[PDB]
Amino acid sequence: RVLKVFHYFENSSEPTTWASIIRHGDATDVRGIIQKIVDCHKVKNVACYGLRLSHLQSEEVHWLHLDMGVSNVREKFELAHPPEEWKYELRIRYLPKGFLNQFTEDKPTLNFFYQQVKNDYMLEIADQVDQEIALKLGCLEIRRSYGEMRGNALEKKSNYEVLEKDVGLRRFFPKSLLDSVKAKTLRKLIQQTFRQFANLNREESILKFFEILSPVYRFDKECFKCALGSSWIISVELAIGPEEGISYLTDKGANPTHLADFNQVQTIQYSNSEDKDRKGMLQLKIAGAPEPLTVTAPSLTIAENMADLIDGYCRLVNGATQSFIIRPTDDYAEIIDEEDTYTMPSTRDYEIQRERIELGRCIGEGQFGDVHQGIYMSPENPAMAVAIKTCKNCTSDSVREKFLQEALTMRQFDHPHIVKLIGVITENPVWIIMELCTLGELRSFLQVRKFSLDLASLILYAYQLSTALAYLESKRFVHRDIAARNVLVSSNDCVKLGDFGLSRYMEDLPIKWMAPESINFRRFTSASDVWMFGVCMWEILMHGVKPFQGVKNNDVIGRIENGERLPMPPNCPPTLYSLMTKCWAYDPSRRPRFTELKAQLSTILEEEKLQ
Numbered sequence: 092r093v094l095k096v097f098h099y100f101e102n103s104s105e106p107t108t109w110a111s112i113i114r115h116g117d118a119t120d121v122r123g124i125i126q127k128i129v130d131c132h133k134v135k136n137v138a139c140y141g142l143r144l145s146h147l148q149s150e151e152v153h154w155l156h157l158d159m160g161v162s163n164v165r166e167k168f169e170l171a172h173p174p175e176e177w178k179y180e181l182r183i184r185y186l187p188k189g190f191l192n193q194f195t196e197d198k199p200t201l202n203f204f205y206q207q208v209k210n211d212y213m214l215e216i217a218d219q220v221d222q223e224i225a226l227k228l229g230c231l232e233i234r235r236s237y238g239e240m241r242g243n244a245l246e247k248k249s250n251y252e253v254l255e256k257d258v259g260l261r262r263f264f265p266k267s268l269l270d271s272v273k274a275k276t277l278r279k280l281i282q283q284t285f286r287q288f289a290n291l292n293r294e295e296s297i298l299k300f301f302e303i304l305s306p307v308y309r310f311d312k313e314c315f316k317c318a319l320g321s322s323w324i325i326s327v328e329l330a331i332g333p334e335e336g337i338s339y340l341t342d343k344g345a346n347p348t349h350l351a352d353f354n355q356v357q358t359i360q361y362s363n364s365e366d367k368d369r370k371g372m373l374q375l376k377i378a379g380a381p382e383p384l385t386v387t388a389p390s391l392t393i394a395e396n397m398a399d400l401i402d403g404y405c406r407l408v409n410g411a412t413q414s415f416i417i418r419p420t421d422d423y424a425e426i427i428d429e430e431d432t433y434t435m436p437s438t439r440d441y442e443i444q445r446e447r448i449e450l451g452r453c454i455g456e457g458q459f460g461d462v463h464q465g466i467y468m469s470p471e472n473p474a475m476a477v478a479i480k481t482c483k484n485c486t487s488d489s490v491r492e493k494f495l496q497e498a499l500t501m502r503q504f505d506h507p508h509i510v511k512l513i514g515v516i517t518e519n520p521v522w523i524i525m526e527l528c529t530l531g532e533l534r535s536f537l538q539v540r541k542f543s544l545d546l547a548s549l550i551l552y553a554y555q556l557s558t559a560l561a562y563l564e565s566k567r568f569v570h571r572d573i574a575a576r577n578v579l580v581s582s583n584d585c586v587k588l589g590d591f592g593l594s595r596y597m598e599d600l601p602i603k604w605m606a607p608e609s610i611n612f613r614r615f616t617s618a619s620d621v622w623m624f625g626v627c628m629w630e631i632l633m634h635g636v637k638p639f640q641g642v643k644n645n646d647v648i649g650r651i652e653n654g655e656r657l658p659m660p661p662n663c664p665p666t667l668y669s670l671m672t673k674c675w676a677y678d679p680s681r682r683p684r685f686t687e688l689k690a691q692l693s694t695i696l697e698e699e700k701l702q
């Protein structure tokens with residue numbers, strides 16, 4: 092078939108949608124699925140993983156045994172409810188004996204595992220954990236997730252307002268905390284309780300998280316409400332964990348009680364209750380003792396689950412690969428991907444035949460593909476100089492789609508200072524045809540004309556740009572990368588905004604151009620575009636000099652974090668510099684809109700033309 096397996100291998104998408112999509116060949120088993128997924132992620136501790144299946148409307152859960160083939164698994168469950176109300180998630184179930192230490196040396200797992208626990212914390216107990224706790228744990232994730240943001244960042248009103256009003260505090264703290272307490276007050280608490288977690292790197296935040304959490308949430312063991320006994324029955328909470336084996340208790344608070352160490356389980360057996368109710372009957376045989384320790388579950392399903400667990404642990408505590416449970420060509424498992432909504436309608440109209448393009452010389456070097464210059468011959472019309480953007484690893488089916496997504500967007504745009512889309516060639520290898528800006532890249536152009544480009548032409552470029560940006564701001568499109576490197580010159584008196592491509596996924600940077608919230612929290616809005624335009628004006632006014640020449644990249648973060656700003660360029664009017672510094676207002680909401688910058692530059696233009 093295939094089948095969507097949710098998991099916890101981090102990715103810069105909304106966490107709910109973290110999966111892999113696996114095409115399986117017929118008698119492929121659960122082991123096989125799992126085996127592929129963890130190898131995508133360079134996992135060492137492979138034995139620790141399992142595959143759980145749950146309905147959505149009902150909260151019962153099924154642990155799928157390694158050997159059970161996926162095929163007979165789908166059939167036997169999905170013989171009741173549609174594949175849409177079934178969710179398969181990979182998880183960590185069988186923990187080794189020093190598991191945190193162990194995982195320290197298995198980064199992907201330690202991460203997977205953190206992500207796993209957090210989620211259960213968020214779902215099960217966060218909303219009634221002690222309140223300094225929610226605070227601390229919340230802080231730890233903040234500290235972890237934004238591993239690039241300076242430790243004192245949250246002392247700035249507006250930084251916090253990005254979290255609160257843009258990212259969502261619900262992402263880090265439980266619902267009850269947030270609405271039980273005054274926004275203004277909450278700000279301060281968070282501020283104070285972050286102080287201590289300010290200098291912790293990622294790994295350390297995770298360990299502190301566990302260390303803080305465990306004392307009040309026991310993710311190290313799994314507890315069960317079940318009756319023990321043979322024909323004589325008593326009532327307990329069974330406890331299975333790597334550090335104790337198999338304990339019970341009833342008591343109140345006082346000590347639990349050992350039953351059996353995993354290195355002692357001879358065999359595992361599970362029937363339905365051979366009597367009145369279909370209760371879960373689990374039959375553990377223990378080294379020495381001729382009495383098979385009987386356990387009674389409230390359902391077979393729960394019996395199945397407990398069996399899995401123990402079985403998992405025995406297959407672990409001993410180097411074994413195969414079951415401790417009594418038994419009453421074609422392991423294809425390719426990792427694929429997306430089944431997205433098709434490309435919007437659509438090309439019939441801006442389709443170009445490849446025979447109508449002569450592909451000349453190379454002029455630019457992209458990530459996903461090169462940019463060449465060429466001739467285009469529409470026979471109704473004369474030859475045309477064009478830019479052609481070509482795709483490198485062309486037949487990665489969804490790489491192609493993300494590619495010519497760029498062509499779709501460019502189709503919606505029509506503006507004197509944004510590079511026209513001429514057409515597309517949608518067949519591998521896909522090309523996109525755009526107008527060719529002959530005088531090329533702005534930086535170089537300025538550098539070369541440093542002593543023959545008057546101040547007036549300089550502000551013209553700035554203006555021309557701002558119009559392009561306003562145009563885009565109006566169409567709610569965020570560019571994410573405004574810099575002279577990205578601006579072409581079609582003419583001595585004419586620049587055009589270029590690019591509009593994708594950088595997914597995720598990935599992980601033009602720091603020296605970046606709005607601080609981009610650097611701290613990875614938000615990119617129109618306001619950060621205004622920031623970057625700021626730097627871009629500077630660049631222009633500095634005749635293509637790089638902001639912060641010879642300045643190291645965490646040196647820049649701090650400079651700016653403190654209050655430093657790029658110096659007033661030589662022979663830049665004082666208004667325009669005033670206009671730049673507004674763009675570099677730290678707090679986003681204080682920067683002007685492009686529509687407003689357009690208007691200023693316009694008048695700064697006229698004044699400077701007449702004087």
Ligand SMILES: CN[C@@H]1C[C@H]2O[C@@](C)([C@@H]1OC)n1c3ccccc3c3c4c(c5c6c(n2c5c31)CCCC6)C(=O)NC4
Pocket residue numbers: 454455456457462478480510525526527528529530531532576577578579589590591592
């Ligand atoms: C970082 N500067 C590069 C200069 C070069 O190649 C790049 C990769 C970049 O220009 C935006 N480039 C694009 C990237 C993505 C979409 C469109 C273009 C693009 C385009 C052109 C272009 C040119 C050059 N570069 C161009 C382009 C260098 C020489 C002048 C012409 C172009 O003329 N139309 C689109």
